[PDB]
Every structure is written in C-alpha cells, then in structure tokens.
Design a protein around this ligand. Structure first.
Ligand SMILES: Nc1nc2c(ncn2[C@@H]2O[C@H](COP(=O)(O)OP(=O)(O)OP(O)(O)=S)[C@@H](O)[C@H]2O)c(=O)[nH]1
Ligand SMILES: [Mg+2]
Length: 174
C-alpha cells in the first residue's frame, strides 16, 4: 500500500514516521528533501506491507512534489495543532494540490504535536500572537471541509494516538 504524507514545513511529518517505525524521536531538525520508509503491520487479521513517502514542506519543491502522487492509495494531510497557519494551508494549499492530481484518493487529516496543545509553555507563547491552539472541534470541521474520511490527533513524541493514524490509513484502503 502507498501512503503519501503532505503538510506545511516543520509540522512533524518526518518525526511521525520515524517514531512510528523505529520508536525514537530525532533530537535534531533536518529538512526532508524526500525519503521512503516502510513498515510491516498486521491489522484486520491481514498481513499488510505499507510504504510511507515523506515529502518536502517548502514552496521550493512545488513542481517536484506532485511527482509522488500517481498510483497512491491514501493521503495524510498534516498540520501542527500549535501552528494555525499550517491549519489554514490545509484548505489553502494542500487540499487543492492533492485533489488536483488525485481527485479520488481518500484523505486523512492529522493534527500533530498533540502534547503541546495543553502545554502552558506553548499556550502563553501563542497568546502573545493573539492566537489559540486548534481545538478538536475545529479540526473536526476542517476535516468535513476537505472531505477527509477520518480526523485524528497525535504526538510523535509521546506516541499518543500514533498507531491509529496508520490503522485508519490502512482501513481506508481496505
Ligand atoms: N513536542 C513535539 N514536537 C514535535 C513533534 N513532531 C515534531 N516535532 C518537532 O518539530 C520539528 C519538525 O519536525 P519534522 O518531522 O522535521 O517536521 P516535517 O514537517 O517533517 O519537516 P519538513 O519535511 O516539512 S522541513 C522537530 O524539531 C521536532 O522536534 C511532536 O509530536 N511533539
Ligand atoms: Mg520532513
């Protein structure tokens, strides 16, 4: 099965795949040009081979990113639950660019950095920008908007809700 991970620069796409496959969060930040991980999971009582395609976040790779999209079974659209810009760009940039090349591929909306949503350290940082974190009901609505099959929230650090992301991704194609 083919799964493409798409979202704004520095939302936690890479981390979300490395923590899921290896159980270790990278201590340093290195921007993804392109990678290709895989994982053998057993769900629905079925042997499942899953290929995960990490992409780039910048507008630099605009016309080189869509190359990955053909022959895809399911998409993940990601955004930081702390970064509201990335929440906007779902509808603004990613939902257009995706449905443009693939108008049938089921989508799953994903709120990353779930641990930091309740963190007072971040809350009073974003307060200075007169902005709140994205509540669950808000993503729930953004999911309905872009016609996603599911909406899920997870932290790659604490691995909270992380298995489900890929449980639902597979369940979408099955
Ligand atoms: N607290 C917390 N921090 C996270 C989480 N996921 C990612 N981060 C932090 O955010 C930064 C970006 O992670 P990364 O996975 O590189 O994003 P990306 O979207 O893949 O990066 P890019 O390919 O668009 S340039 C990292 O420094 C990481 O420590 C998370 O679940 N919880
Ligand atoms: Mg990346």
């Amino acid at each position: 099965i083919k799964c493409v991970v798409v979202g704004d620069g520095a939302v936690g796409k890479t981390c979300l795949l490395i923590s899921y496959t290896t159980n270790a969060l990278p201590g340093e930040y290195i921007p993804t040009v392109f990678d290709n991980y895989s994982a053998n999971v057993m769900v629905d009582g079925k042997p499942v081979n899953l290929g995960l395609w990490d992409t780039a976040g910048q507008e630099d790779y605009d016309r080189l990113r869509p190359l990955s999209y053909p022959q895809t079974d399911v998409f993940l659209i990601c955004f930081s639950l702390v970064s509201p810009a990335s929440f906007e760009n779902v509808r603004a940039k990613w939902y257009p660019e995706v449905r443009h090349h693939c108008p049938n591929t089921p989508i799953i909306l994903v709120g990353t950095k779930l641990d930091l949503r309740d963190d007072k350290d971040t809350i009073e940082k974003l307060k200075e920008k007169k902005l709140t974190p994205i509540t669950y009901p808000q993503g729930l609505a953004m999911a309905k908007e872009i016609g996603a099959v599911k909406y899920l929230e997870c932290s790659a650090l604490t691995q909270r809700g992380l298995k489900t992301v890929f449980d639902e991704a597979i369940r979408a194609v099955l």
